[PDB]
Amino acid sequence: GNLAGIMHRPDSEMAYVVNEQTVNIRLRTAKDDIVSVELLAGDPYSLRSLPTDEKFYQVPKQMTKIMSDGISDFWQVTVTEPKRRLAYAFLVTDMLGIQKIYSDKGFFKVADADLMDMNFYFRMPFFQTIDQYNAPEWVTDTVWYQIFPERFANGDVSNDPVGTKPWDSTDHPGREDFYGGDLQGILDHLDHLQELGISGIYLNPIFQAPSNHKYDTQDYMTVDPHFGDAKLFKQLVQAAHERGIRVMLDAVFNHIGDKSVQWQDVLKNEQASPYADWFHIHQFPATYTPTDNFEFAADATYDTFDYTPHMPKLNTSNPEVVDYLLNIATYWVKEFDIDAWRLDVANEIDHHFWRKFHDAMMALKPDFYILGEIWHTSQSWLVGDEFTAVMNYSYTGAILQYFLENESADALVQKMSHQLMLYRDATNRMMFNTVDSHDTPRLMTLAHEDKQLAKSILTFTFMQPGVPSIYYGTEYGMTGENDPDDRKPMVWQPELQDHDLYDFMQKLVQVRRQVIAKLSDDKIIFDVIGERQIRLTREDNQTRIVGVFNNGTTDLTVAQPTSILLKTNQSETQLAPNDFMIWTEPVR
Amino acid sequence: GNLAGIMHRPDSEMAYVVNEQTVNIRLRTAKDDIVSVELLAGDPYSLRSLPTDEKFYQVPKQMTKIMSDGISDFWQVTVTEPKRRLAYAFLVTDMLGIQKIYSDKGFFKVADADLMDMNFYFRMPFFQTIDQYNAPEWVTDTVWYQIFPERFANGDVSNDPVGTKPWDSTDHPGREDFYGGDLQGILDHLDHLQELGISGIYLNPIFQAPSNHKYDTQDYMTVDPHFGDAKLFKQLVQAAHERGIRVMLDAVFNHIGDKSVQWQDVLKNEQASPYADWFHIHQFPATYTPTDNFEFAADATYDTFDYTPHMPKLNTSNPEVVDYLLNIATYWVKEFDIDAWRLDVANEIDHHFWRKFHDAMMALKPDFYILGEIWHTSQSWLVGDEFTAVMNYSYTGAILQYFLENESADALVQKMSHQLMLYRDATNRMMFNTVDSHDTPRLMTLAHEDKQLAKSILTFTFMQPGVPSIYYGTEYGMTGENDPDDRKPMVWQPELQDHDLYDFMQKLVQVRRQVIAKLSDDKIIFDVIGERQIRLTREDNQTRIVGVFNNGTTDLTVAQPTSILLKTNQSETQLAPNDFMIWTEPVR
């Protein structure tokens, strides 16, 4: 067999605690190289301490091949052990029938393995629930809706910025435009969110800042006055909660804006500023050479987000900065009862800080949801001690690549399988899936205004393990290239709304919340059934949901389902190119 | 090539911060499958934000194959980046000349890789020294000596336990015997430790407890009165420090003894005890059925170390237990200035506790040494936020297996290489190498009283990256089977001491402290030069230390070295079976 392709990393996503007496264990092997895997496992001390002749290694446990990413196969098994201590090793057999034991000490013929020595084995030394990953149950039933507040609704002209433009959803907004959207406008349209069926709002930043996006924070402790005030924000959160809608705010903790009190003090006082060590200043005075692009300088003497001199990086290792940020994080939760924090550029802040942040948030609300913005592999933030999940851009990006280009279905399934096997099973359910956002081109533009294709992408994404989010306006087919063009004023004029797409998104949200979210500990299966034809199955012990997606250039015939939930062709058996059909069937 | 054998895990021992601007990156490949690896790396934001035509991926960095474990090859490179943000990917070429790029997104032909997208790459998002692993420099120059205090020297008969036996190093001690060793006896023989050349003492537990080993703690805040008192312990630490000898105590935090106040309160008050939740009690009253072995019960209604009813497991998730243990840990450091804690059964206590323990100790002493007792892979405790090192029993165990049995030299080198590549380079230097201890048979007994073999094992171990420790009496050739027979009274009678071995150990300690410890950032090379013949090389930029070990059954001829440091044959060119020769040569 392919020994170099076999790996088990103890105390990781391959060996983790699910509850006080139960663990999940995974093994990686080379794809289709290993025919079977059994786990030998039990209490390490039992081997030599118990007087019985029975030994734990005499009764193997079968592992199941759960996924493949085209390179490796991934095997898993759940183990219960009342003594809450586990030693384990793997019996692996290849295609030619060659069997070896694989353990912490390496590979062995069975006859050569020192199975009576607890130290031969990999170890889960004591099952520690304090160290485990916990998924908040409420997220399961959530469909999110993301609001960029400057652009959702102007509920109050009296707080509008100077130079506010007329509300026109057909505009191509510039980087520094204002349209007057505010918190009163969100409050005014909660009925729309409830009618669409969403149950969580993700707001882009709302704290005082000079820009239309407010990632260049001036004051984290104040609602931007062009958006509202503390009383209005409290009213909004209470009104959302009364409708069953939770609220997630955007925490911009990697960097602060250059008009903050703290940075302005650095500019006045140089190294004598009480805030000098709140930043990463290489040379005083803190300077840069302006360029024709306000968001770029080549030579700032301080670290910044990207290369913008207006977003000096915060030194989150400084205890005073830690205290400042934790007090902000605590304030909005304690005083306004928000349900979650989305963490902007979360990967560029240290793990030490995020552990303290986690502990502080869980002390306030044990079911708090902590969502990191990270666009690459995020294993080290998703162990159970830092974030709940990340914005799952690598996953939705693979989906977009499949539907919009000509990849094989095999390639998509391989990428999604790779992603799922990076993380604990419960973590995968908490991932935040949005096909587009304020940082991407709009779905309907990527789809070249092919509504059927847009519906296929949305439906496929809504069937995935992660929780889905709808970027404002998706439900009416809003167009836009990347930022700033993805931030058009929300389309409230019915003549400009795609009503068929809105009806469809209502139905899709209902399939997600009433069917997909109510399966019990389901298994997901990706089957490639033909060229660019995928059958997605989610199933529990009584009910199976199946989605067939035909994204080739030919028609596809399927058996007539008894219980169709959602489809795009008028036929109950025929799928034309880019059609899909979702149905439900009992498990037999 | 063997794609399933290639792996890079970001934010791990394969990608870690060395200093503010410098990182080490590793890649695993299948053994001898990949001919070369180049790293493509630079600031993620530079690709699209800088106006230059130059891109970081245009100038690859060569990686070096540093080790192989017989299954995989391990490649490494050091990267400096002033912007302190790194995106990277690997250019891998196999034996047939097939080249691909390997990144966070998978494997690609170069022409198909989206090299302008920062999210294509693996990421070190910002170099965080607060998250990095730090090795305390003083450990580099240390040779440790481990004292089991009941058995090292009786410096005071007046504190002896009832039934203390005459001091006789030829006895075979029973599990419950006492010989009267105490802290005054250690103080009395500091001259012996200084003459041997050791610079650190590791003490087995010294706090109040009823047994001869004192792992069944009664009171962590009191020196056991048969050993001494607080004034005497302070005198000992100051006398050790005056000689340049640091002091490491044994922290027994997984479990407490059943004669502790806390457990006795549980026995009196059942669940109404204020200490009920300091333990893991499944059923009250806390009970067990005694057996003929005092260290075993089959049915204790509470979790224990192993199956002994006398060592109830502590619930270290309980904040009151956390506070109690941290106050103990702090007390001995603050009040007595000890230099290190050795953590008994450290793997069975949760990571959350060990992070708090780490933070508390480093706040007292930034160069504190935290040594975990773990007999299996220990990656998750050695990231930089918990322990400094572990007792390196898997490494010394592989060495013993080679010298005492008939393994190939290839097998030993593979095992040591596997071990080193589990951990960060600096971590490997901090590992605590002891060939025997109070929990193993004695070296001289494992070697069947073959002194030459014992010398070979010690010398080979002392050339390894980790810091070595001498279990008391090794220097005089003490014998013993496993516990309790490995705890004989120290041999102070010259007629019973191996003086030739003592002289040799003095010389070996000097080679370690004066030569091996004074190389500058050396590279270690394991060469198998013949059947059971190994050439071990450690070298920096000016000086190379070479050890040749002949453990076959034939003679071995080597070139006459100019500068022999240590050897066992009278010849300067001939090594008989089990001879070795260490020499030094300039690097050219």
Ligand SMILES: [Ca+2]
């Ligand atoms: Ca307004």
Ligand SMILES: [Ca+2]
């Ligand atoms: Ca005594």
